[model samples]
Target chain A: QVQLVESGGGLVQPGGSLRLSCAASGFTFTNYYMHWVRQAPGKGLEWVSTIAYDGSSTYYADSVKGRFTISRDNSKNTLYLQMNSLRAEDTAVYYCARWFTDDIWGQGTLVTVSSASTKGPSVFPLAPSSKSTSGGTAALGCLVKDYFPEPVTVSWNSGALTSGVHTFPAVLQSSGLYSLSSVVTVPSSSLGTQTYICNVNHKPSNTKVDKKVEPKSEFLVPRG
Target chain B: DIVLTQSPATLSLSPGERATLSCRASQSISSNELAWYQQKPGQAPRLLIYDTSNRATGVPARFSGSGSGTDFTLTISSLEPEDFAVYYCQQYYSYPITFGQGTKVEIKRTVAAPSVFIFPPSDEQLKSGTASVVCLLNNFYPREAKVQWKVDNALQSGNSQESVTEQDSKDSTYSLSSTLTLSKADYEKHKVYACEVTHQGLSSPVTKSFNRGEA
Candidate 1:
């Protein structure tokens, strides 16, 4: 039952340095290896490096061999990744995973290395009338639109029992900005009765937006 | 680091079918240093084989591993419905251990009902003071089946083990077996013993009963 949390400075200008930290818990840290992986906005995933638990062995991907340094501290059970001479291309979401299997992943932290003016994401609730057809659950969505800097995090917070929640990958707009959406579902019994709030966090601008919604009563009925 | 590459990007077959997957390494690796993993959607990877051919704890014998040096093979003697997932081969011989890209096993849907049989111990076997009764479920599709034992109308726990589900390579059906062991005194005391098998294709559980006097 190991867990990993990643934290780092969201804004890093080109030619500057970036240090990302992954704090691990629940398991004996020294018994496993830690690896770093990054996904550039609208691009595929790339393996960065792996740091052995004892700090004696380290392996780096051929592309980032010279620019990235991977290290770990056994005492704190934390893994660190330091990158120097960052470029605009370095703006991406970084994640820490255990071992080469990549089975478990940390919630990704976005790192933006840009000099342009950035705008925070705007959040709005989508019409709740369109519930899922398979199960008569009450479905709600939060649309986060027109954000500068590609990466943004969207999450749902509902005091009531929720069936499930999903955050889709951000889609790049024709204007070079990004927009994303998140959906939350509750049982039909809670439709029109429970309220759910969606939070959109834009790390680069250090801003957030929240939108709340409650589905209409008619939407709870299963469609034939 | 040895780089592992798997062949057959995707395997499409029905249950009861046999599958052979290949994993080739960039360099030679010790037989004991190789392992295989199975990863289902949204689930953590499960270790199937370690140290070449040894099945992991609770792993079925149907999944086996073999190979040496730069070549390795993971063969599923009989594919179960749950075996349709991604498989990876990893080499732990060196630092920076590497894994194969992965091979996906897809299911080709086919339906069939399980045919079950029960085997009771022979007279000589019973005279040994202990005996094992085996229940075999064969020619089933989808590989979702449960086998349970009952002794004298009470559910029997422990003392029983089930084999891994296997698929026939050609017929696209599944087969599996379970065994329940009993001591001479317990066998005599519980004159009625039964093996019950439940499967998705069956309307209800199929059971076979054995009376002590009949043996």
Candidate 2:
């Protein structure tokens, strides 16, 4: 029954640096390599870096190549990761695994890179406002743009409406902020006359936005 | 870096059906570095296979993976209700790890006829000199149904609003609702409004009608 545990500070200032440690026990750490994995809130897992047990070899994901360093201590059976010049994008839960198999994993550590400047999301609907009456589905896209500190929740609030809402993975923009899009497809008949709202909630910024779709007669026309 | 592409984008099948999903890598990869994962809605991805063909611990025997080098396949000998999900393939042999975009497996089940209900607007809302009526369609399947509105036996246009169809995950059924708005004068004249729902499985539309005089 081998075990791995990860430890690091909960918060770090933007542009600062932080070090995380993964300690192994109940197994021969020198026989297996350690791999680092990260997951931002509401996002998929990412492979970060890996270090050999002898500390003689290391591999870094191209995305974090210059910003992260992976090192290990064979005598103490510990693995270390040093990240520098952190940004809000670096805020994620980090985990360690044995043998790159991920069958054995460390309890993750949440690392928040805080900055004085944070922005709430800008929510709006995507185009093609009209839907076909021939049983064709119309998608109402809610674009949540330019939000900081990563994870935000997007939901709909139309009464008694059974909607299928899907949110795309948030993408890190060139501006160093994160943007995401969620689309809800309702029957085409529900589009032009009723008011639909896109709600966004960002925990770190303590911000929320409820954007209403502007009613327009032109939006009622059937798509060709 | 090796790029992986999954074919067919989406697979539609019924339970007890077998499915073979394909993944192709841009370049040759080691047999030991290939892996497959299953991602269910609102859940983290679970590893299904690694080292080309071996199933991960605790994975169902019905789900097996095979192939090597540049090509790999994840096969479900017989799909269960829980087998509907997006599948991805990843390779760890190269410098930058890569993953297939994903292929979704959708369940094709018998369509259940919808139960329809219509409700008029409350007094406060009606005070605005406008009439709003909501129509709800419950207990349907496939989530791709249409709602139409009619006034006194004539098809009405530019007045109805439909909602997104929702799924009942427990039994794989669906429900939807829509609203119709009309002028207060139309309501006062005792006009008859009908809500008609159309589904692929039905030969004719299911309709529910309401008359203002009854309210």
Candidate 3:
């Protein structure tokens, strides 16, 4: 099965353009048709268009024209859709997809277009040992860069499995960005030496990001 | 600005059968502006129109469409059981956005008719040594109605008679009539002679058969 992974950030200022990427892994880029889709912050999904890998032919939805152009680079297995003349209303998650007999969608990226600065919140560390006795929970703090505050879920797992509660700091930065972090608790016995992923969900775009933390060498005991 | 409306919350259709769908716009939508789409349970909709009458590339030929402005019809000439789903119409002239309220064409209580059309009997009923048959259309809503004579359940060629048409006194109702001529042997040989009526609000065509001795 082919998989599409996306790369880009959360904050985008009004008038600024967004160039998001959906990288394909596990399949030949030359064979499949890649498509771009847009989702408003709280609205339904809308089809933007699809780009053929060979000729770069484009097919677009009637309502979508004049603002979006889709292109692909077969070498890097990357498909790109550039959005111009951005507005706050344009702040939404974008997804890239490739279809053979069926469609495989990428984990989306949220590009929150605003008049403010274009930086998301920063990540923070968990407080002193919220670590569970059974070695199940782990905490990681996330600080969003701009004021485009939206709820995000954070989770900790055994491998790069995608699931769990991800918390984003509700605090707003001086630049008007907001930040928050979540501590995902996993069953230590069930986890292996792989990456534990933290995923955030934003509707319409379904954007998610993952951070991995290695197991602490020596368990710290509470200072008496 | 034809506005097509559909009733019945759901459509239950079977495969390999024939299903007729209606498309009625608020006003005339030039036959060229009409088109239909089929959407499965969780997939994006696909275009079932362009130029108002031709099927899109890769669309099954069994799926055929015919109708004109104000009152349009879409017939899945052969409803593959998999073809059971919702169908919608759209107008391209109305730029930016224009689509009809979709109608679910589902499998009904029973397979009423197989989208079969017949010509007037080849052999007419013997009356005074001459054969005759009458095609009657009752309980037909004329908002957009058309009638035709058929033989042996197939459209007979080279025949003409009175073309009957009527519109409701108050609404946009309309009806039509026509007759066919055939030899006595044609009537007796053709076992099934049916009258087919097509309307804008029906999911299936209505047919009435002729009795050998009765007109």
Candidate 4:
């Protein structure tokens, strides 16, 4: 009846601390080693490191250096993982595991970083409505890395008045990737028709910037 | 960092023929320790080397190892039915030990038999339940195989059980077990009980099943 339980929230601001816990039951905490692994959305698994029960030994994959720590609390049969200076790319699903000659993995937990403070160029259509298909809309997303001080804000089109409002909260995944998604509603009848613009505006930039422009006949889909 | 590679993903050997397994390390491993492990159809991983060259206590001398630096070899002087499974090499010289890819050994001309379970019956399962389920293996040769219980493809850990090495047959086998206190709910939920096995020669697990409560 051995079990490993993971705890953590799905959202946190960038530069915010990311902490997750794995608690065990039905096994001696001091008899085995606890390790951490990460899997970003749609990616292969990566081994982070292992923390021995005695707290005297730790091992990390050669690729990992700085900004990460693994610790344990024997009395509660738990292992703790913490990473600092969280960035958009650092969001991902994290897991805990026990290792001997092989490994037994725990259910994973997802951690997300909010993009409210930083600013980035947004994409949009040159014109509105007349070119878009009704019920079909343009989707926009972004990949931001290495920014700090959380709460990155991404606005679609700058200084222009819009009719509808659709927002997608960013998700921080176990492999440390920040993904934000949003879709705009266009009349399907307008398909083969009107032009609609989709834009993304983030913080630190006082002026609005557009990255891509879409006309009704060619609205792009954002690939996850 | 030194990389370890194994070749001939699948190997065929005749009985009594010399069986040689090769493992090559990318960087010179002269200062590191290399060990070979053998795994039959179903069982846990067994250690075959300690401080390089030296075999674990009780290992057969027939299973010999040699080579130094980057090139290494593991040889079974005479292949036996029990030796047809998988073999692997592990290095302990660096932090975070690494294992070689793996090589599987099989009899060259024998008809394949049904898979077998290597898990044993626990005292708790034997005494507490109205009926018991057991997995027994005899005369196991290679030591790289591992035995595990899979409930819906997820691995369940258990303890190693009885150990026997018969001198007359020059063979040995060990047992391990995963037990549960049965209830109607337990029986229904675990209708598909299985034993999972792996070895160096095989990349995927071989499984065997038994219906619970019905027997």
Off by over 4 Å in 1: A1-5, A9-11, A24-47, A50-57, A87-118, A130-139, A148-161, A164-166, A184-192, A202-206, A214-224, B1-3, B11-21, B35-65, B73-98, B104-215
Lowest-sum lDDT 10-residue window in model 4 chain A: A125-134
lDDT of 4 by residue, A46-69 (tens): 557788778898887655447678
Order by lDDT, highest first = 2, 1, 4, 3
lDDT of 1 by residue, B1-215 (tens): 67787898778876688899999988888556887888654334567887777787677899999988878899998877677777888777875556787888877665687656555543444666766665656556776788889988899997765553323334555556565767777888878778898888889988877666551
Q: Lowest lDDT 10-mer window, candidate 1 chain A?
A: A126-135
lDDT of 2 by residue, A57-127 (tens): 89988778899999988889898999998888888888787744445677787788885456787665442
lDDT of 3 by residue, B128-191 (tens): 2333333322223422355665666678655533322221122212222334445566666766
Q: What is the C-alpha RMSD of each candidate to the true structure, in Å?
A: 22.5, 11.5, 29.5, 25.6
What DockQ class does candidate 3 belong to? Answer: incorrect
What does DockQ give for each predicted structure?
0.01, 0.06, 0.01, 0.02
**Which runs in model 2 stand beyond 4 Å of their true positions?**
A1-46, A54-57, A68-224, B114-139, B147-170, B174-197, B201-215
**What DockQ does candidate 1 have relative to the true complex?**
0.01
**Candidate 3 whole-model C-alpha lDDT, 0 to 1:** 0.52
Off by over 4 Å in 4: A1-53, A62-224, B40-43, B110-215
lDDT of 3 at A186: 47
Clash pairs detected, candidate 2 = A186-B164, A189-B161, A189-B162, A190-B161, A190-B162
Per-residue lDDT tens digits for candidate 3, residues A33-54, read 7777666643434456777667
Q: State the lDDT of candidate 2 residue by residue for B56-82, as single tens digits.
A: 889989988888877799999897767
